[PDB]
Design a binder for this molecule. Structure first.
Ligand SMILES: O=P(O)(O)OC[C@@H](O)[C@@H](O)[C@H](O)[C@@H](O)CO
Ligand SMILES: O=P(O)(O)OC[C@@H](O)[C@@H](O)[C@H](O)[C@@H](O)CO
Ligand SMILES: O=P(O)(O)OC[C@@H](O)[C@@H](O)[C@H](O)[C@@H](O)CO
Ligand SMILES: O=P(O)(O)OC[C@@H](O)[C@@H](O)[C@H](O)[C@@H](O)CO
Ligand SMILES: O=P(O)(O)OC[C@@H](O)[C@@H](O)[C@H](O)[C@@H](O)CO
Ligand SMILES: O=P(O)(O)OC[C@@H](O)[C@@H](O)[C@H](O)[C@@H](O)CO
Ligand SMILES: [Mg+2]
Ligand SMILES: [Mg+2]
Ligand SMILES: [Mg+2]
Ligand SMILES: [Mg+2]
Ligand SMILES: [Mg+2]
Ligand SMILES: [Mg+2]
Lengths: 219, 219, 219, 219, 219, 219
C-alpha cells in the first residue's frame, strides 16, 4: 500500500526535517498546484517543487488543478517534477499533445478525476497513464466531507484495468484516514494521498505521526 | 530606509532560520500571491502566509497579483496577513468596498502599480493607502530587466504625497539591487522589496547576505 | 400531475393577484435566474424571489442558469428560496459541496439538464436530488421549438429511478402545452413547468387561463 | 431637481400602483440590469422593462451593469427602453458603434462612471451623451456606504459641461438621501436616483414616501 | 472515397489556379476557422470564405474551432459557406438552436469531434448532421502525430449509422496520408480531409500533387 | 505621405499580382490579425503573413487585435513579420516585456490606439515605438463610420512627438479616403492605411486603383 503525503498540509518550520523523513518513508510527494480558477484556492507552485527537489529522491507528483495545464509543463519539469497529474476536464482538445509533451520531458503521466467526472472521460488515453487518481472530495481544500459514492469509481477503475490488461496504479485523494482506509482498499486503491486527517494531525513530530498512520492502515 | 524581503526568493530548507532572522531585521515580509492569470506564474499562497505567521511579529504584506482579489481577503486575514496590497487594475468597481473590507479585518491597505499604470488610477482613493508600491519590472517573476522609466513614477508619487499632505510610504518592487539603490532613493523610495539580486544571492548564509546588502545600501 | 408556473411569463401588473392564485393552485413557483453568460439572456433574480416570498406558502424553485451557482446559494436562501435547481454542467468539481451547502440552508435539491447533456452526468449524485428536470428546449427563453428527442431522456430518467429505487420527481421545462402534454406524461413526467403557451396565453384573467389549462391536461 | 426612482427597490405587490404614481411624479425610471459578472449581483432585466412599459409615459432608463452591453441594445429597445446608460469601462473598442446603434433605435444615450473611473475616460464621446451619471457607491447593491470623494467628480463634470458648452444632465447613483442631498446639489447634480434610503423606506405607502422625500429635498 | 482539401495548407501565390483545380476534382473545400482560444492558433476566416466563393461550385465547409460559434453563422452564410461544421464541445446548451439557424440560412450541418470527445456527445442530435468528422489529431495545426485510437471512433460511428439507419458521411481530419489511408478506409471513412502530408507536399504543381495522392489512395 | 494597404481588403484571385504591385508602390503591408474576442471578427493570420512573405521586400506590419498578443510574437517573427503593432489595452502588465521580445526577434515596434483610448496610455513607453497608429473607427471591420473626434488625437500625437523629441511615424487606420485625406494630413498623419474605400474599390485592376488614390491624395 503506497503513500503520497500532501505537502500543502506539511509544517514549513520543519521543512528539511519533514521532506527527508517523507523521502525515506513514502512513495511519492503529492504537490498541489492550484489556479484560483479551476478550483477556488491557491496552494503550491513550481517554486515549492524546486525546493522539495533539493532533498528528494522519491518522485514529485504535481497535481495540476489549473485552467491551463499547458502553461506549467516545461516550468514544472525544470523545477524537478517527476509526475504530472492532469485533470481530464482541462485537456479536451489537447490530451494527446500534453501527454506527449510530458513524456518528452521524461516525466510520468498521472490522470485525476473530479468526483463528478466518469472514468470513460479517459477512455481514449487511459492506457497512457502511469497512475490514475480518484478525488474522494470536491477539489480545492483539506478537511472536506468524504464522498462514499466514489468507492464505485475506484472499483470500476480496478475492473477496467484488469479487463484491459493495463498497469496503472490507483490513487485516492481526499479524506484518506482511519475512517476510510478499509473501504478504500476493498474498493481497489493502491496509493493513499495522506494529508491532515490521515497523517500530520496525529502528532507534532512527524515520526510519531507516521507510526500512528501506519498502524491504523494495518487494519 | 525600510526593507521588505521577497519570500518567493527565500530558501525553504532554512525556513525557520530565515523567517526569524528577517523578522528581527526587516520591516515587512513581502508575500507574492499569484493567479497564473493576472500574471503568468504561480508562487505563494494563504498556506505560506499561515506558516510565516507562526514565527512573525513584523507585518505580513500580501501582494495580490490575482484576477479576483475579493476572493482572498477573508482567507488571508485568517491566515495572518497584516497588509493587503491591491492592484488598481483589478479593483475598478470595487476599490472602496474592498478597502473597507480590509479595514474591517484590521489589516493595512497597500496599493501597487504595474509599470504601465499611471498614478492617477488611484486618485479617488490614494488617501486610503498606508503604502503605495511601484513595480519597476513587469510583474510575475524575479530577475527581470529594471525599468528606468519608473523613476518618474516614484518622483510623481512623492510630489503627490507632499502636495496632498498624505502619509503613505513609497515602496519599490523589482530589481532593487546595488545598481539601482541610489537612483531609487533619489527618486523618493521609502521601502525596498529585496529579492534574489539584492539580498539572497550575496551569500548562502542569510546573516552574511544581509550585511552585504546593508553595506551596499549605505551608498 | 404537478404544476410549476414559470414566473418570467407572468403579468407584473397583477403581481399580487397572480401569485396568490398560483400559490393556492400550483405545486411550485418556477423562478428562472439567468447569467447572460450561461444562457444568453437575463430574467429574474433574488429580488424577485424576495417579493414572491411575501405571499408564498408553496415552495419557490430557483433554476440557476448561471456560470457560478456558488455565488447565489446563501443569497437565495435569505431571499426565501425553498428549492435550488442546479445545472450539472456548471457544477463539475463542486456538486457535492454545493448540494451540502443547499441542505445546510434547509433547501431542497433540484437538478436540471440541458438538451445535450446525458443523464449519466448526474450518476454519482442523482440520489441526492428531490427533483430532476429535463429541458425540452435549449435554455434561455420562452416560445422555443419543442425537442422531441428529449422524450427518451424523460423515459430513461423514469427507468433509472425505478431500477435504482429512487424517489425524485421528474419535471419538464420548455414548451409544455396542449401539443405535448400527452407525450410528456407517457414518457414519465411528474411535473409540468407551465409558461406562456401552456398557461398565461389562454386568457388575460389567470383563473380562466388555469381552467383551460387544467382541462387540456385532462387528455 | 429631477428624480429617477430605482425600481430594484420597489414593492412588486403594488407594482401597478407604484409605477403609475412614479410615472406622474418622477422624471425617469431607473432600471438596473446586472450581469452577475460586471457586478456581483442580479436584479432586473428586459422582462421587467417590458412590464413597466405597459404603464409608462416617462422615459425608461436602463443602467447596463453587464460585461457585454452589445448583447442588450436591440432587445431593450424592443422591450420599450428610452434610455440606455452605458458604463465606459465596458465599451472600450465599441463606444461609437454602440452609441450609433442606440440612436438608430431612437433611444437616448447615458454614460455612467464607476467610482474609480475618471471623467476623461469619456473625453472623446462625452458630447454624445444626454445624461452622465456618477456612481457614489461601488456598483451592485442598495444600502452601500456613500463615497464623499465622488463630490469632486460631480463638480468636474459640471465644470467640463460649462467649459465645453455641452448640455448633458448630471445624475447621481448611490445613497441619495437626506444626509447627501445638500452636498450633491452643491456639487452640481441635476438628477437624483432615489432608492431605499431616499424614497421607499420613508413609508409603506408610496404617496407618503414621496412627500417625505420631497420635503427633505427642500433643504 | 470523397476528398476535402485543407485550404490552410494551400499556396496563395496560385490561389485562383488551385481553387479552380480543387473545385473540379475534390468534393469539398475544408476551411478552418480558428479562435486563438478554442485552439491555440489562427488560420482562415469569413474573408477567406468570401474569396473562395468567387470561384467555387463545390460546397465550402467551415470547420468552426471557435469558442462562440453562434457569432459566425450569419456572417459565414453571407460570405458563401455551404457547410458549417460544429464542435459538440462548444454547443452544449445551444446545439438545436444553432442547427436550426444553420438550416435557416440554407447550409448543411457538420459535426466534428475532438480526439477526447466520445460519439455519444452527439446522441440527441446526431441524426441532424449531414457529415460527421473525426479529428485524428488534437486540433489546431498541420503535421501533428496521428492518433491510432481514433480508428475505433470511426468504426463506432459507422456502426451507429447502420444501427440507427442514418445517412451521414464520415470524414477524417488530421494526418490523412499514405501511412493512414488504408486503416482509415477499413475503419469506415467516407471523406478524407487532405492537407500538407497527403496532398500539397507531393509536388509544387497541384496537378501533379493530386495525381500522386490519387494513386496512393488506390492501395 | 506613406501608404500601407489593408490586405484584408485585397483580392486573393490576383494575390501574386497585387502583392508584387503593392511591394513596389507602398511603404508597408497592413496585416490585420484578429481574435474574435478582442474585436468581434476574424480576418488574417500567421499563415497569411507567411504567404505574403514569399513575395515581399517591404515590411509586413501585423496589427494584433488579440487578447493575448504574447502568444503570437515568436510565431509571427517566424512567419516573416517586420512590425508588430500592439494594442495598449492588451498589454498592461507586459508592455515592456513584449516590446523587448519584439526587439529580440529583430522586429520594429508599433502601437495602435482604440478610439476611446487616450495617448497617455502609452506615456511610459511611447518612446520605444517606431510607429503609432490611431484607429479612426472602432476596430473589427472595413467600411465603418469615420470618427472626426480622432483628429484631435492625431494632433496631440504630433505635438507630443515634437515636445518630447521623438521620431515615431503617425499612422491612421479606418476610413482613409477622399473624404478624409485632407483633414488627416492637416491633423498630422504620416501614414495612411488604405483599404476598400481608399484603394481597392476605385478599380478592379490594382494599377488603376492606385493611380486614382495617388491623385486624390495630391489634394
Ligand atoms: O482530507 P485531508 O486528510 O485533510 O487531506 C488533504 C488532501 O486530501 C488535499 O490537500 C489534497 O491533496 C488536494 O488535492 C485536494 O484538493
Ligand atoms: O528582481 P529580483 O532581485 O530577482 O527580486 C524579485 C522580486 O522583485 C519579485 O519576486 C517581486 O516580489 C514580485 O512581486 C515581482 O512580480
Ligand atoms: O415554452 P413556453 O410555453 O413559452 O414556456 C416558457 C418556459 O418554459 C421558460 O420560461 C422556462 O422557464 C425557462 O427555464 C427556459 O429557459
Ligand atoms: O443607496 P440606496 O438608497 O439603497 O439606493 C439604491 C440604488 O442606489 C441602487 O439600487 C442603484 O440603482 C444601483 O445601480 C447600484 O448598483
Ligand atoms: O496533418 P496534415 O497532413 O498536415 O493536414 C493538415 C490538416 O489536417 C489540418 O489543417 C486540419 O484541417 C485542421 O482542422 C486541424 O486543426
Ligand atoms: O475603412 P476602409 O476604407 O474600408 O478600410 C478598412 C481598414 O481600415 C481596416 O480593414 C483596418 O485595417 C482594420 O484594422 C480595422 O479593424
Ligand atoms: Mg491533490
Ligand atoms: Mg510583489
Ligand atoms: Mg427554468
Ligand atoms: Mg443603477
Ligand atoms: Mg479542420
Ligand atoms: Mg488594422
Amino acid at each position: 500500500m503506497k503513500i503520497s503525503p500532501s505537502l500543502m498540509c506539511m509544517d514549513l518550520l520543519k521543512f528539511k526535517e519533514q521532506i527527508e523523513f517523507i523521502d525515506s518513508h513514502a512513495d511519492y510527494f503529492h504537490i498541489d498546484i492550484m489556479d484560483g480558477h479551476f478550483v477556488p484556492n491557491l496552494t503550491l507552485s513550481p517554486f515549492f517543487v524546486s525546493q522539495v527537489k533539493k532533498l528528494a529522491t522519491k518522485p514529485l507528483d504535481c497535481h495540476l488543478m489549473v485552467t491551463r495545464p499547458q502553461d506549467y509543463i516545461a516550468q514544472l519539469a525544470r523545477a524537478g517534477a517527476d509526475f504530472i497529474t492532469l485533470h481530464p476536464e482541462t485537456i479536451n482538445g489537447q490530451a494527446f499533445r500534453l501527454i506527449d509533451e510530458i513524456r518528452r520531458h521524461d516525466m510520468k503521466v498521472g490522470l485525476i478525476l473530479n468526483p463528478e467526472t466518469p472514468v470513460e472521460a479517459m477512455k481514449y488515453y487511459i492506457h497512457k497513464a502511469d497512475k490514475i487518481t480518484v478525488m474522494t472530495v470536491d477539489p480545492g481544500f483539506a478537511g472536506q466531507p468524504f464522498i462514499p459514492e466514489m468507492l464505485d469509481k475506484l472499483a470500476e477503475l480496478k475492473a477496467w484495468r484488469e479487463r484491459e490488461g493495463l498497469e496503472y496504479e490507483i490513487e485516492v485523494d481526499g479524506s484518506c484516514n482511519q475512517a476510510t482506509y478499509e473501504k478504500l482498499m476493498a474498493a481497489g486503491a493502491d496509493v493513499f494521498i495522506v494529508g491532515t486527517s490521515g497523517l500530520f494531525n496525529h502528532a507534532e513530530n512527524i515520526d510519531e505521526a507516521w507510526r500512528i498512520m501506519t498502524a491504523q492502515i494495518l487494519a
